[PDB]
């Protein structure tokens, strides 16, 4: 949302979804 149609925007979206998937399928040990 904050950086659309840019390179850094897609870069952060990749980091975002990679963190979303890892917390989903590997578990989050930092939230406890």
């Amino acid at each position: 949302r904050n950086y659309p149609a840019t390179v850094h925007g897609a870069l952060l979206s990749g980091l975002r979804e990679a963190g979303r998937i890892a917390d989903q399928f590997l578990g989050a040990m930092y939230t406890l």
Partner: protein, 46 residues
């Protein structure tokens, strides 16, 4: 948006009460010019 403008960046859109001296004096002038009561005290005068 404007984040893609590399040249010729478009800058259009974003960034108590006191009375004045002399008033009470004149009002006193109006007050005593209408009355006729004595102004000097009676006992100090006597």
């Amino acid at each position: 948006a404007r984040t893609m403008q590399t040249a010729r960046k478009s800058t259009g859109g974003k960034a108590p009460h006191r009375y004045r001296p002399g008033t009470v004096a004149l009002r006193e002038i109006r007050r005593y010019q209408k009355s006729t009561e004595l102004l000097i005290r009676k006992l100090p005068f006597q």
